[PDB]
Amino acid sequence: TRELQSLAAAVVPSAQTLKITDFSFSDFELSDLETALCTIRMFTDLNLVQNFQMKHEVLCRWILSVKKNYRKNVAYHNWRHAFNTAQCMFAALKAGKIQNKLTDLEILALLIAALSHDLDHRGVNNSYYCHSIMEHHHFDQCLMILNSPGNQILSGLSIEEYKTTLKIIKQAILATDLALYIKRRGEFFELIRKNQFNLEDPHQKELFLAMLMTACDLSAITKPWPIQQRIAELVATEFFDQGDRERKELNIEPTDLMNREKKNKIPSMQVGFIDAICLQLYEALTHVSEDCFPLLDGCRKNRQKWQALAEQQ
Ligand SMILES: CCCc1nn(C)c2c(=O)[nH]c(-c3cc(S(=O)(=O)N4CCN(C)CC4)ccc3OCC)nc12
Ligand SMILES: [Mg+2]
Numbered sequence: 001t002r003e004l005q006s007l008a009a010a011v012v013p014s015a016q017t018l019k020i021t022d023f024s025f026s027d028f029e030l031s032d033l034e035t036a037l038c039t040i041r042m043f044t045d046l047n048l049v050q051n052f053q054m055k056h057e058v059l060c061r062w063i064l065s066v067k068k069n070y071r072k073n074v075a076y077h078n079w080r081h082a083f084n085t086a087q088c089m090f091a092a093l094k095a096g097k098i099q100n101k102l103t104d105l106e107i108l109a110l111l112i113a114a115l116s117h118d119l120d121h122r123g124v125n126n127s128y129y130c131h132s133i134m135e136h137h138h139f140d141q142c143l144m145i146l147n148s149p150g151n152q153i154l155s156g157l158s159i160e161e162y163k164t165t166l167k168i169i170k171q172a173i174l175a176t177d178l179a180l181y182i183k184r185r186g187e188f189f190e191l192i193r194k195n196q197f198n199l200e201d202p203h204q205k206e207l208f209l210a211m212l213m214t215a216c217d218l219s220a221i222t223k224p225w226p227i228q229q230r231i232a233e234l235v236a237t238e239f240f241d242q243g244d245r246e247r248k249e250l251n252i253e254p255t256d257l258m259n260r261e262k263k264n265k266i267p268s269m270q271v272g273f274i275d276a277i278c279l280q281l282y283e284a285l286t287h288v289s290e291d292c293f294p295l296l297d298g299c300r301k302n303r304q305k306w307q308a309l310a311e312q313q
């Protein structure tokens, strides 16, 4: 296609130029093309392109097939969110110094997962066990693209590597199910507290990758105020949209979280979301690597902003 040709023939700026190394990065002013290029730089600077012999044109096609499988009519869960999640993973890996703590395969799997964790999301969200029905679909969507002719970016891996990578990609994507996050963080938080976290432990490694995925998945809550407020409104829109739709089809009354009115409650709930789900996670991550402080730091500053709004409301 023409789009593919443009992407595969364009020059890929340096990560520095793209500014994708900093946690404060923002996509809002970038074109789709620019996000695809950033994505290429991501796979490139993580040495995934050469270490795994990815064919440029195939990588390009795969990036487009993934972007393509996201629905733009969905307010928040679209390509951009997937892209920002991967941008954060890249940032955390580089600026957060998390890269030296993982293997190339773990890294390859995480990048792919971040980009694919919400594939074909329809805008139907949950609340807080649902058995990760949605994430299973996202994975199925990810595998499908990874196997489609011309998009096989994983060809080049041995059979054992492919098997390993696939297993990790699946756990990564399923880990983006908040219910599983809540189900597992307790143990993760205990270790960090008792000061006995050990990445050398296979189980503790998996646990970490899961916490990492959810951390990147929620990265918006850590971005600078202007960006956070903007994305927050996208989240709200999708929820309200779901509340209205859910009431249209089924005669169901939306919980305040999904009801369009009571929108003056977002500051209050954003503070609640941050307290109950984000802060502990980003703080704990800082104990793994102090270079991830910006994430924690950005989360706190947002809680102050939302708190001001709630009182002032
Ligand atoms: C599926 C989306 C998960 C998510 N990602 N991000 C970045 C956010 C976010 O910023 N806010 C919320 C969010 C969460 C709750 S909540 O369910 O968690 N809420 C707070 C805590 N408890 C006490 C109940 C209500 C209420 C409102 C929200 O956003 C309005 C824009 N979810 C996500
Ligand atoms: Mg999801």
Ligand SMILES: [Zn+2]
Residues within 6 Å of the ligand: 081, 085, 117, 118, 176, 217
């Ligand atoms: Zn997500």
